[PDB]
Amino acid sequence: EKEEAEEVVKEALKELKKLFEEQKKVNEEAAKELEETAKDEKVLLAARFAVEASRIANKASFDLSKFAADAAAAAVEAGADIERVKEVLEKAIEAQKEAAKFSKKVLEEAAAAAALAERGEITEEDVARFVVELALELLKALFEMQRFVNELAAELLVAKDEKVLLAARFAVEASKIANEASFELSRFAAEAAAAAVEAGADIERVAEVLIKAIEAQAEAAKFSAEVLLKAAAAITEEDVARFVVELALELLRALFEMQRFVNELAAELLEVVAKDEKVLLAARFAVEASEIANKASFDLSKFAADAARAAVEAGADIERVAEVLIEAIKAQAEAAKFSAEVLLKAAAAAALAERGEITEKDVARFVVELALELLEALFEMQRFVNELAAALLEVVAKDEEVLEKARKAVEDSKRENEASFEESRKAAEAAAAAVEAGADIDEVAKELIEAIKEQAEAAKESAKKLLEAAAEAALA
């Protein structure tokens, strides 16, 4: 029974291993042939990209297939109908074959556009667009495999306990929301490389940044698999809630690390594009301001999970705590996408300035109004997480004297967050009025960075005093 079920899993992983290394040898020999038809270096630079990126798609294909097998093995160890395990293993084998057929389809596009360009007609920008468009193709393909395999691993996770099943539902929900945000962050890194190619940047810098973004997806893909395999590797009702909080913190931490790595990939792509000094200062200002907003949002998401930690140690049930953590993770995903859209629009305006279509005052005006958009989105998240902390307090604060001190602390943070945005808004419309009067972007950006950091400082101190009140309410 279960021993035979463990025999089907090991043979499934055995087949997945040979499928992965048969496709490895097929693609590795298609790379030598791709080296032959690489007349001129630009074709070889694109051929080596398609080869290196296809080896990532094939390697990430097996890592996601092995995760499905390890998830199926864990199901057998803790009760499993063997026919639903065979069904999941069969679907994972088809996904490996499908991802293998795509890794070769990538090299088909490479060899086609290769000799086509050396024959003529195809310019280097079309080769540069081919590399960028291919980057989009693999990033989307890796996300679909991870979404499909995580769906299979969801069906596997066995609990036989409502509370533990609610925790498995949270792990599946939180990982799916984070994997969607990581895909959109890597997509913005590829959309930034598309604006750099159409602006005149060299494909060599664009190619290596895209490889950084492709590998970032695979590393986050395996991390999400390892945490979900920890979730399967499960008692105490409070240790289940402690797992949910620690899982929510790890995904928020990996999401910010993706926001940080992708933010730095945009700075590299702006350095090659922004050849003008004053436009480079606007690019470097928007890059830093966007990253500051990423830290502040992550600090506001970590405060929510820390407030949820103080709630589970006070005795709040897992169900309400899982809701607040779900709302916090998607709140960080909203900021991650919003901060990426702001930085994407900044790269476009810098490209317009490089082409000469807009002036430097237009770029200075644009990065200032983008700074206010980030200051508003940070303030809207401060009010959102403040509502979540007030919700968690309404469950743990039962003594009317404890509730009164807690509700007062929620109000004080509401006034502190509001007043901090007024300070950041006054400085925003002051820096905008300076741009129109002809003030140098160096001084405007310097004073706006200090305003954004001062709101981030006020947000930290407000969250510190608020988490303090929730902790004392838990002690009583």
Residue numbers in the entry: 1 to 157, 160 to 236, 245 to 486
What does the paper say about this structure?
Here we describe extendable linear, curved and angled protein building blocks, as well as inter-block interactions, that conform to specified geometric standards; assemblies designed using these blocks inherit their extendability and regular interaction surfaces, enabling them to be expanded or contracted by varying the number of modules, and reinforced with secondary struts. We construct twistless helix repeat (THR) protein blocks from identical straight α-helices (typically 2–4 helices in each unit); the length of the blocks can be varied simply by varying the number of repeat units. Restricting helical geometry to ideal straight helices with zero helical twist in principle considerably limits what types of structure could be built, but this is more than compensated by the great simplification of downstream material design, as illustrated below. Using X-ray crystallography and electron microscopy, we validate nanomaterial designs ranging from simple polygonal and circular oligomers that can be concentrically nested, up to large polyhedral nanocages and unbounded straight ‘train track’ assemblies with reconfigurable sizes and geometries that can be readily blueprinted.
